[PDB]
Design a protein around this ligand. Structure first.
Ligand SMILES: [Mg+2]
Ligand SMILES: [Mg+2]
Ligand SMILES: [Mg+2]
Ligand SMILES: [Mg+2]
Ligand SMILES: [Mg+2]
Ligand SMILES: [Mg+2]
Ligand SMILES: [Mg+2]
Ligand SMILES: [Mg+2]
Lengths: 384, 384, 384, 384
């Protein structure tokens, strides 16, 4: 189960680089030099890395220091063959963003947030990134009167529209992906789920430039079915990028390694991505637990990729099995794929087999055979 | 705090009529005659009633029996002055719908589901309803392989598109509202939140005909902020109808009377509906607990309206208070309403006050004053 | 992976017999004759069956009808070799129990609840049951003023104390197990978790007669770690019985087949039960989904046992693996088993290696190696 | 609604002193000198302060520095009249505690954890504290194999037993209170709820020395009813201390000011504490949101006390109202307080009115009148 760069596994600098500071504890690990992270991830079989601006260039750095940091980074990429498919902006760590970036109540903060983003879009394009992610982690509220959400949505739309105008005017080939999260660090975060983000995109001036970057653990923080949500994003043509990790239910954002947390959900996610032919990066946004030393960090990162690859093999075996194909027909998955009324409205209304002469009791008595199908799925997942 | 029909409070027949059967217990109350419910609700100050087809006309009724039931209903409406602003279809109780109506795997069930709906749209228009609600309570799955969600979304779109074609072809003045719910009675339900429903509407052929009918308790079953979600629906121009009730957190759908459950959320909801000038019905989808006799049913229904009216008075007092208006300015709610960059992109990029000379430490040191504002809100809610 | 009666798998009559009525839908399956259920479960490899009084003897049955029903049941047990290890009382379905049985506000209902229980304890002993379960599903409240919980706990204690006096006075060899649940069908249920039930037992007059009967899905309805809770019950010597099923997170009680829901939790549960040598029944309290016909019911029941047996094999392989044993030592599980201060308090206080000369930075730098251990656990679960 | 020191409101140094570092952001406020916090809280009407060792004496401080810090603290207490009713140990911030203190897998860490605690018990007694709190925030796991929970419970018991031996041997008048939390910062924390902590205490060698210190938001992080849990702790005689704050549902630990979050739960909590005559401190463990400057910190702290006092007045008015007293009788709260069978077991068995001649249908038809009672409670809460 060995990864190759052709599997398109990517990692954020801030994942393996997380020093282990949590709300109640100090860091347990020294900081990693981004150049060291690039080399070590390349040795494990990764395809590329991602970054927030502030991960790569320390906040407040001089232009000269900024040049030096980018140059050393670019050399490690050249030395390893690693790519940078995605970048993003840190609009959440600095105290100035304590009430948000794009939807801060203070107008001068919103303007600064936009300028900070634009500078990193330029860098992202220079380094080859094809997706620019936005996680509005500070966009929200702890109390009801602090944020008029209609006004905040106007400001969020205004910011994204200005970014679309900028990339169009520069001629950049880059698309945006909004990353939803329901809460943490704000009591409630705006655009809390994949559905809310998808809905918001349709009100932007250039909707074609915007998709979603869903994260396993975030949708599970609302108790939602992550494969279902990904299916709706694919149906809408908006799955531009994805963040893979694990989460044990409705609690703080754990960012466990992929495969941890809800294992069956991970199986059904991989089944869907592979069946739909998703071609983008398989990005891991995870934190190696602070219990670990650096050997544990790399073991956790390796496990992310390993578990994707085991699940890929088991999902493929499931769909290839003639006994499963026959169970899918027994459960009428084939009929769900057929139109309800390709004959048209008037035909349906005149069809007495659809109402006047329909035997509801005979249809009702038919079992769906779903438990047999699901146990075949379980057997395949477990290799039994 | 006495309701009048001008407050536009409405109730479903199935609310005060709930007999108290739950997953673990038999009914505790006899069935109510819909004509009795109309008379009693009119005496309490309600404006109108809503219904599922099967609430009004028993399933399997003959055409003649159907005529008789509608006539007796219409007479109670004439006798009381009660209106019927909304109607809906029962696509969840009968065993035939056990895998869904619009997205059942069996094609003949989907066709029957559509014909059953169309028949009740005709009745709805005859009785004056201006909104037709769809709650796809059986649309979903307990297991991953049972439902290909992309195919199910194609079938859901196909059904709603056919309904839009029908109402257009008949010339009816009626709009559709989708009611989201995350789970129960299915393990996961399709279009689980307001955001997912809003996103789905934008892919229909005639999006103008479709909005949402959110329910307090349903969004709270995903741990989401209901006023925030309603703000996004209003921003999108899609809040066609609303279902008011109470819910204590993430658990089974309790359908408590409005004001019960999360009281502060109820305050912020009423503040928003009144400030935005929402003009539709204030519909209660609640269940009087099965501990109650019929006196308790009417006391619970009365409490729904009473609590809306107390919260309305307190929210109005909050917004009218000069001390609150001054706190809103101190927290820069006025600046959140102003454009970030009405001067345009090029101006922003050339503005050195927005980045090069912005003092982040001075902006960061400014308190938001949100706790003082929220305690003023609390004081107003509690009458202190 | 074929079950034998020596695996001690048991099923409640009400599980495979569930007709599929849920809050929003009618039954989808005909009722099963308990004699048919006993025969079919015996053919699948089950060891025994359990029952509520009202599952076996219809409520209101005459004494003569009661005799006939017990006789036919006993004959199926004799014909199949099936045992009845556990029984329980239905104190939740009938409307009289709408505010509880043992803690109903009405004193005459509490007295009836006790008499109904006592009658079935006699029957339970006659049929050989060694554990009597109590699930107080109606003991609780939807509102704060309806139930003084201190008074309700006095009444709960009074009821259980009287039952202990009864079984002692009759000389019966039977022990009680309390089954906790946090909510549903009441808004909040008394003794909501394993911890609360354990705490309550220590205040009874004869604590030795009482243990717990935890259920996978119930503890997961509070977001709690079920293996952890079972570990505390075993530590207390109180795990008298267990209910196995599956649950997808914090929502209504799904009662999925065992292995469904949180698969990793199921693995860690089986690892614990087998390592601790739990010797009681492996009882499944599950509902075959209402989508299923009777073939699906038996397929779901079979899957319960199958999944226990696959997980048993994988957990045994995990603990037998020398590479895992070495990882357990690397993570110092061996040191967690050793006393902290068997040398005593005075020794510890005089030990300068424990404080004055302890190198906190050297201890802090040691990795715990937990991610490597967990990936070995994952590899074993998946057969990789 | 002005607080006095006789209302026994207390605050932890770490509450108003929280600098605003969260998982995703830097501090927004400078550190507060504990002497300044004591003076400012005394001016607001507080009765006292609490502390972790590391809040008062910086970790690694020399003995001489330790003396100086305690002396300056003691002078502010003398100058203000503030008391120190409770103290606790920080066994969670330093990296050495990354796998726990009392239940760390490393034996030398467990020994250090005990020595660190003992040193602060001595200081606590010197400063007058009557309760010593333990929050085992690092006691737990992110993965199943990392912690054998039976062994960890043996180590937890061993630690608490040694602390009881120490305080007995020194002759100290101090009692212990365990503070439960279900998760955060560990994926699952041992003794996750009030019930689990109560159960664990009964296995200690000197149970009389140990109670609980429940926290509003922690029990609500498991979706549990906090007043119910407090009622069970009072019933057990174990409510030694309480932590008051607010929490919006099942998510990260928000530590909002008291009254925020679930307002009705706060009303029912205050009703219970006052009715039961709880005489200990009303301690606030809350965090002023990081959006706030120092004026906002003190406004948030003031709001904690204000909201307790408003709720106290409304709960007293509720219980004093003759119309409520009559509703309580109508709902048979008086009968819930009466014994079920003070006549004894034999009497109950011979009483044909309890079973043979009991009219279940007549009892079942009686309404409980709970909705009328609850609306009277709502009316009183809102001042209507
Ligand atoms: Mg995350
Ligand atoms: Mg992410
Ligand atoms: Mg509902
Ligand atoms: Mg509704
Ligand atoms: Mg259950
Ligand atoms: Mg059970
Ligand atoms: Mg807390
Ligand atoms: Mg606390």
């Amino acid at each position: 189960y060995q990864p190759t760069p052709e599997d398109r596994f990517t990692f954020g600098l801030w994942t393996v680089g997380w020093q282990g500071r949590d709300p109640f504890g100090d860091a347990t690990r020294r900081a990693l030099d981004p150049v060291e992270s690039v080399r070590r991830l390349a040795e494990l079989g990764a395809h590329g890395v991602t970054f927030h601006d502030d991960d790569l260039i320390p906040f407040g750095s001089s232009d000269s220091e900024r040049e030096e940091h980018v140059k050393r980074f670019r050399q490690a990429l050249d030395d390893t063959g690693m790519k940078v498919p995605m970048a993003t902006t840190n609009l959440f760590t600095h105290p100035v963003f304590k009430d948000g970036g794009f939807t801060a109540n203070d107008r001068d903060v919103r303007r600064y947030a936009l300028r900070k983003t634009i500078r990193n879009i330029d860098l992202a394009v220079e380094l080859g990134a094809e997706t620019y992610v936005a996680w509005g982690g500070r966009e929200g509220a702890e109390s009801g009167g602090a944020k008029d959400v209609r006004d905040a949505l106007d400001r969020m739309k205004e910011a994204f529209d200005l970014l679309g105008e900028y990339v169009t005017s520069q001629g950049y080939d880059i698309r945006f992906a909004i990353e939803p999260k329901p809460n943490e660090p704000r009591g409630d975060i705006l655009l809390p789920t994949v559905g809310h983000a998808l809905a918001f995109i349709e009100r932007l001036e250039r909707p074609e430039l915007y998709g979603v970057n869903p994260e396993v653990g975030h949708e599970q923080m609302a108790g939602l079915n992550f494969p279902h949500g990904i299916a709706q994003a694919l149906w809408a043509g908006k799955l531009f990028h994805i963040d893979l990790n694990g989460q044990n239910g409705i609690k703080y954002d754990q960012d466990l390694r992929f495969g941890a947390g809800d294992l069956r959900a991970a199986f059904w996610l991989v089944d869907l991505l592979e069946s739909a032919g998703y071609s983008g990066p398989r990005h891991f946004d995870f934190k190696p637990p602070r219990t670990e030393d650096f050997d544990g960090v790399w073991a956790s990162a390796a496990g992310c990729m390993r578990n994707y690859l085991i699940l890929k093999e088991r999902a493929a075996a499931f769909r290839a099995d003639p006994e499963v194909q026959e169970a899918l027909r027994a459960s009428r998955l084939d009929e769900l794929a057929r139109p309800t009324a390709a004959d048209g409205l008037q035909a349906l209304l005149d069809d007495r087999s659809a109402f006047e002469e329909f035997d509801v009791d005979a249809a009702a008595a038919r079992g769906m055979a779903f438990e047999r199908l699901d146990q075949l799925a379980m057997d395949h997942l477990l290799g039994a």
